[PDB]
């Protein structure tokens, strides 16, 4: 029940209305990622770089397995059926970790069938391979650095002394290792979760998640919307320390629309009070749900031209005075002074323009006469009833008709108090208010004594 | 009209003075960027990856053209006229960008006459010439890798590996593109996109784009690092997969009667503890007005501050009174950590908190002592020239100002807290006290 007519006189012009939708109900697949290439065909003078690389990789891979084994040990089935957990042996946990442990226990059922092809996994020598045990079960294997070895190093093995090829291979391995530590290093404190995105997981393949997603066979109309809102996630379920590979499960959700809810945006325009410019300080996005008004932290969501897409509800409470201001009580809306020379000064809504014509050039094309604003008006509304065409600097604009009160330009409003929004000014204002309160209490003590 | 002598006793020591510069008056050029390579010399076993790549690219490229067509339909000649009813909702910047797009659309008609020549290019950088007065530059996204790596090795390995390599390269290029040219681009009409983000369609090599166009100036790096070089998309081809971009190159102008002052904070001693003052570190003085500035959006050099937009901010009255001499209105905060600056050097004069740090004079071999009623110590060469504060020996100059600096006191302001949760706690406490006071004064109202 926003009062748009009173809000426009303050400088808030209504804009586009959008929908609200959240993801749910995924479907799952699983893949194998190898972290060491096959160097058989160049094995004559590989040197001793592979042993150093393996030693470096083992010390990175060990803590993840150590963290997984805690939940692997204390989960089973109690016949007495669901999943049974021992709370004493775990000690400290949150709800999300417990849910992720249940999901890990569910995925361990299918990990066992994949772990039967360990011999065939180590024998692959291509970037992308499909392994078939039976027609029922397939698996896909991706190798980290096989394409560069197959394309560059092998064909040139005889045209240059291979002491240079050893250095090239070592440099490539070190460059690959440098990128991993940003994701799989000690920053990964909690591997038992399902909130890691596919973009971060794709670092073990070199950052190429398009190949993974298109090889897995996923195809939908909202692929990019799901990709850019961080809704496609993955979970690590198995680590091999002797063969150096990991098993990952990938989730793919769908979007659902929230009923009886919408999001409204506003456009700010400066206005004139006595001799200065002011801007109102009001939230630019408002969520209305079941006739309830609230805030939303839109920095975590994706904004399109028809809808707002999030992976989680982001509603926030709102004070009573702001709700009173938004329902039509303009006396309770703060404002701030303008000192800079760059600020918006006019806006267009439904073919009608709202402009601060005191601070900008304002004239009509049809009659050649200027449009004047008095000192008792905050803004001007212009439609084709006065004159059809208008000139605003170097642009000519043709206008529509306003739907509302015919006496818009002859009515005034009440204005709120001025504020400051800088960081140090908050502390200064708090100190001043405390000082005033202390002096008031000091006087009221003597008032009490009398 | 800052009072530096009183500010130094609080712990704020004056530093370097700089200028203020803003961009204006650009020069324009235009270029063509292709997003699909030429594989004519390896076409025997390219497989079927190009059809899938084209299908994937068309879906990305369609919404941008759909968004441009809205302004394309409703603009014509009359100067330039726009139909406001058919547009509906817009801001001022969008309207200005639409006018710029209409102005730029004139040369695209001449450029589009060379579509056949654009299709036949097989090099990374090409110069197409129709007549001597008009030439265009064509950049191709992935041609160099194909020409250097895949083609010379086409006969030494089975070409299924070549097919896989080409597919992987195309997928990597698309993964790089999607960060910039995906659904994050909601308003392609505006002209605020930087050249660094635009160069992602060429693999991030904006140096080649800038140097090939012939631009050369002494403020090249300053304009590049302050985000003052922008671009705009004006034409998209869906059947040929190329775009046309216009590039702007401005110049810097100096704002007159304006400068920016910096302050260095040094902890001081009060009661039996350390304190630090909470004042903005950068102050803008324009004509005779003092204000704040959000310097996080601007580039700072050793003699000037370069911005693409004015960033002035209002300032409260109490802070202005504090800066003009009233030291009883300036807040302070307690120090709990063991890492904090404790001395500073200004014009050869040392300002030190000699209670917390060790202070000695090398000439006489005698320590320098600070009493319990002093906040800081000023050290110059009228007492003794050489001083030692640790592993460093320093020689000092002469101080300009009052000769009784160390014998005069000041007034101190009230303590504050700056943590996020502390703000909420303080607001709650103040509100409760005010409500209690009003509830009591209701009784006095009754009396």
């Amino acid at each position, epitope marked *: 029940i926003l009062h748009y007519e009173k809000l426009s006189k303050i400088g808030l012009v209504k804009g586009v209305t959008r929908k609200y939708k959240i993801k749910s109900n995924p479907l799952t697949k699983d893949i194998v990622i190898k972290m060491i290439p096959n160097v058989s065909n160049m094995s004559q003078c590989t040197g001793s770089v592979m042993e150093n690389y393996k030693t470096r990789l083992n010390g990175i891979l060990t803590p993840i397995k150590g963290a997984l084994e805690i939940y692997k040990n204390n989960t089973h089935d109690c016949v007495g059926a669901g999943v049974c957990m021992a709370g004493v042996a775990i000690g400290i946990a949150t709800a999300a970790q417990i849910t992720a442990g249940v999901a890990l226990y569910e995925a361990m059922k299918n990990a066992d069938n994949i772990n039967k092809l360990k011999s065939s996994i180590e024998s692959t020598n291509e970037a992308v391979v499909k392994l078939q045990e039976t027609a029922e079960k397939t698996v896909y294997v991706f190798t980290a650095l096989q394409d560069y070895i197959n394309t560059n190093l092998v064909p040139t093995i005889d045209k240059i002394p291979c002491k240079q090829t050893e250095l090239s291979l070592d440099l490539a391995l070190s460059k690959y290792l440098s990128d991993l530590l940003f994701v799989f290093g000690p920053n990964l404190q909690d591997p038992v979760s399902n909130s890691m995105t596919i973009q971060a997981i794709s670092q073990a393949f070199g950052g190429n998640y398009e190949t993974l997603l298109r090889t897995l066979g996923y195809a939908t109309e909202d692929f990019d919307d799901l990709l850019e809102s961080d809704s496609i996630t993955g979970q690590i379920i198995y680590v091999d320390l002797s063969s150096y590979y990991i098993i990952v499960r990938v989730y793919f959700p769908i979007l659902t629309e929230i009923q009886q809810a919408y999001i409204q945006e506003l456009l700010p325009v400066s206005f004139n009070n006595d001799n200065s410019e002011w801007i109102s300080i009001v939230p630019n996005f408002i969520l209305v749900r079941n006739t309830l008004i609230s805030n939303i932290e839109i920095g975590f969501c994706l904004i399109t031209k028809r809808s707002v897409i999030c992976n989680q509800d982001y509603a926030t409470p709102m004070t009573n005075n702001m709700r009173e201001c938004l329902t039509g009580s303009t006396e309770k809306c703060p404002r701030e002074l303008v000192v800079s020379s760059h600020v918006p000064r006019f806006a267009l809504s439904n073919g009608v323009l709202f402009a601060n014509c005191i601070s900008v050039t304002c004239q009509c094309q049809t009659t050649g006469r200027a449009i004047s604003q008095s000192g008792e008006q905050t803004l001007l509304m212009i439609d084709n009833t006065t004159c059809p065409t208008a000139v605003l600097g*170097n642009v000519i604009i043709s206008l529509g008709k306003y739907l509302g009160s015919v006496n818009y330009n002859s009515e005034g409003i009440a204005i709120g108090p001025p504020v400051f929004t800088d960081k140090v000014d908050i502390s200064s204002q708090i100190s001043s208010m405390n000082q005033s309160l202390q002096q008031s209490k000091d006087y009221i003590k003597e008032a009490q004594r009398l | 009209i800052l009072h530096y002598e009183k500010l130094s006793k609080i712990g704020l020591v004056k530093g370097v003075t700089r200028k203020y510069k803003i961009k204006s*008056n650009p*020069l324009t050029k235009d270029i063509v960027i292709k997003m699909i390579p030429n594989v004519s010399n390896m076409s025997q076993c390219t497989g079927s990856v190009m059809e899938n790549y084209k299908t994937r690219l068309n879906g990305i490229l369609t919404p941008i053209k759909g968004a441009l067509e809205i302004y394309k339909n409703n603009t014509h000649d009359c100067g330039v006229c726009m139909a406001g009813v058919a547009i509906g909702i817009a801001t001022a910047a969008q309207i200005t960008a639409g006018v710029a797009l209409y102005e730029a659309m004139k040369n695209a008609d001449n450029i589009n006459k060379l579509k056949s020549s654009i299709e036949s290019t097989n090099e990374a950088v090409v110069k197409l010439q129709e007549t*001597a*007065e*008009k030439t265009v530059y064509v950049f191709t996204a992935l041609q160099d890798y194909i020409n250097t790596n895949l083609v010379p090795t086409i006969d030494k390995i089975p070409c299924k590996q070549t097919e896989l390599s080409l597919d992987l390269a195309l997928s990597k290029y698309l993964s790089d593109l999607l960060f910039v040219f995906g659904p994050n681009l909601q308003d392609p009409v505006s002209n605020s996109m930087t050249i660094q983000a635009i160069s992602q369609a060429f693999g991030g090599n904006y140096e080649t784009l800038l140097r090939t166009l012939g631009y050369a100036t002494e403020d090249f790096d300053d304009l590049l690092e302050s985000d003052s070089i922008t671009g705009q998309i004006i034409y998209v081809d869906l059947s040929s997969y190329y775009i046309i971009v216009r590039v702007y190159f401005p110049i810097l102008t100096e704002i007159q009667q304006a400068y920016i002052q910096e302050l260095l904070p040094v902890s001081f001693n009060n009661d039996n503890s350390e304190w630090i003052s909470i004042v903005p570190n950068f102050i803008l003085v324009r004509n005779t007005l003092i204000s704040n500035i959000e310097i996080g959006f601007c580039l700072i050099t050793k003699r000037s501050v370069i911005c693409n937009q004015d960033y002035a901010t209002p300032m409260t009255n109490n802070m202005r009174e504090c800066l003009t001499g009233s030291t009883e209105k300036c807040p302070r905060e307690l120090v709990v950590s063991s890492h904090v600056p404790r001395f500073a050097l200004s014009n050869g004069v040392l300002f030190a908190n000699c209670i917390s740090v060790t202070c000695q004079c090398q000439t006489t071999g005698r320590a320098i002592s600070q009493s319990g009623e002093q906040t800081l110590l000023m050290i110059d060469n009228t007492t003794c020239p050489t001083a030692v504060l640790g592993n460093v020996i320093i020689s000092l100059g002469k101080y300009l100002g009052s000769v009784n600096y160390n014998s005069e006191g000041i007034a101190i302001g009230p303590p504050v807290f700056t943590d996020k949760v502390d703000i909420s706690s303080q607001i709650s406490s103040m509100n409760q006290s005010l409500q209690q006071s009003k509830d009591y004064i209701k009784e006095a109202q009754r009396l």
Partner: antibody, heavy 118, light 106 residues
Framework: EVQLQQSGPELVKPGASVKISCKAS????????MNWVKQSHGKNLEWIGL????????RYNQKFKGKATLTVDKSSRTAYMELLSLTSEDSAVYYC????????????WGAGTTVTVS | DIQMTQTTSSLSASLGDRVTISCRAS??????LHWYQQKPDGTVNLLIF???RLHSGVPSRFSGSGSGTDYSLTISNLEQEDIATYFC?????????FGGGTKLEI
């Protein structure tokens, strides 16, 4: 119609200073940049400097860095140029011109003001 | 910095003839050349900008061409009002510089 109106001829004693004004009408004053040009008796043209009234920025030629001062007045839409420490070689014709939007060319010129020193 | 040189200062022509005026630069300016006309009374007008584009209201009698460091302006079947002075200006690098000027006469 856009036009620029300049002031009358000026005669200055050596060692003095003088200010020249240029007024604009028929368009939005703050949307364009102003330039000053000097023509001498050899008929060669020299560029002095430019001023941007929207932000308040100036740019000077290094030859005239200490000779000329440029100002604007947005209320009456008037540009001023002040010349300091004039000698006999400062007698010339001065033009105020309006610059284009995207390339460095001038489209509107003034009539010109003649200054003589004796 | 960059110098503009017009070799010919005075040129003689008859009514209805073809005239060409050349302008030369010491460096490459990337087609950033403009042409101006000064009347005997002292008024200055713009004719050609960006080496080939006609200003609004200018008759199609004038044309411009050139590249690299050599540029030219061509006027066809000249009338009586084409007796003036012509200047070439570059707009590639600060400071902006003008040419010497060339005078036409019958």
């Amino acid at each position: 119609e856009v036009q620029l109106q300049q002031s009358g001829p000026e005669l200055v004693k050596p060692g003095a200073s003088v200010k020249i004004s240029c007024k604009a009408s028929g368009y939005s004053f703050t949307g364009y940049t102003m330039n000053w040009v000097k023509q001498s008796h050899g008929k060669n043209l020299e560029w002095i400097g430019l001023i941007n009234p929207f932000i308040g920025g100036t740019r000077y030629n290094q030859k005239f860095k200490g000779k000329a001062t440029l100002t604007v007045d947005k209320s009456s839409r008037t540009a001023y140029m002040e010349l300091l420490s004039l000698t006999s070689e400062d007698s010339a014709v001065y033009y105020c011109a309006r610059e284009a939007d995207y390339d460095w060319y001038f489209d509107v010129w003034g009539a010109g003001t003649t200054v003589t020193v004796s | 910095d960059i110098q503009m040189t017009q070799t010919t200062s005075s040129l003689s022509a008859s009514l209805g003839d073809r005239v060409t005026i050349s302008c030369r630069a010491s460096q490459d300016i990337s087609n950033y050349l403009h042409w101006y006309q000064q009347k005997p009374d002292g008024t200055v007008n713009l004719l050609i900008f960006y080496t080939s584009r006609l200003h609004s209201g200018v008759p199609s009698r004038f044309s411009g061409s050139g590249s690299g460091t050599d540029y030219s302006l061509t006027i066809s079947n000249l009338e009586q009002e084409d007796i003036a002075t012509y200047f070439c200006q570059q707009g590639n690098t600060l400071p902006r510089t003008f040419g010497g000027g060339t005078k036409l006469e019958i």
